[PDB]
């Protein structure tokens with residue numbers, strides 16, 4: 001009840017990226033923990049942003065965010081309603097949908113966006129925060145099976161990451177794992193058509 005001392009939550013901060021520009025996928029860190037903490041409080045991130053898949057952090061969580069159609073998308077269970085840090089200060093979400101576990105901000109200047117897939121293909125690839133590229137067979141509008149199951153630990157921290165088609169288009173945003181006895185056999189994702197609906201109107 002003491003408003004004068006109520007705290008403010010920090011901004012989401014870009015702390016690195018998944019480099020997909022060459023023949024090898026690899027994670028790059030662009031900001032260490034101290035700078036991340038400062039940037040979360042000010043909301044002012046002067047780092048140059050590059051690429052399609054960002055590694056992002058709050059004070060308590062780290063996950064991914066993916067640019068599609070000029071929007072940097074991630075999961076609500078990671079970002080909540082938080083702003084993202086940018087060169088001129090905190091940027092408010094332009095999309096928030098808790099029912100889809102989805103949020104989005106305008107894509108950062110310097111980022112590149114994935115194109116929404118129109119291939120109608122079921123052979124997908126999940127990109128993790130460790131730059132592992134995991135083949136996934138699409139099994140429905142929002143699920144796909146891992147060709148090689150993996151412990152949940154392998155996938156933790158990769159919500160917000162993309163599923164891509166063979167042509168490198170965005171098919172979806174990783175949301176939740178389908179896990180039994182700690183082994184993830186499948187993944188559940190926000191399909192790009194749901195993003196496009198959220199964007200259209």
Ligand SMILES: CC(C)(C)[C@@H]1NC(=O)O[C@@H]2CCC[C@H]2OC/C=C/C(F)(F)c2nc3ccccc3nc2O[C@@H]2C[C@@H](C(=O)N[C@]3(C(=O)NS(=O)(=O)C4(C)CC4)C[C@H]3C(F)F)N(C2)C1=O
Nearest residue numbers: 061062063077078101155156157158159175176177179188
């Ligand atoms: C058992 C399990 C594997 C932990 C869990 N499975 C699970 O629930 O499966 C069911 C059955 C099939 C689909 C799914 O239907 C329920 C829908 C869940 C949801 F996702 F839509 C979701 N909506 C929310 C909306 C608002 C607030 C909180 C919400 N919380 C949610 O789910 C929560 C979160 C999500 C999660 O952990 N995501 C990942 C991740 O990396 N996060 S993260 O980066 O480390 C981090 C926590 C920093 C942000 C990708 C999976 C990684 F670990 F593989 N969850 C639990 C799970 O995946």
Ligand SMILES: [Cl-]
Nearest residue numbers: 100190191194
């Ligand atoms: Cl959805």
Ligand SMILES: [Zn+2]
Nearest residue numbers: 117119165169
């Ligand atoms: Zn495609």
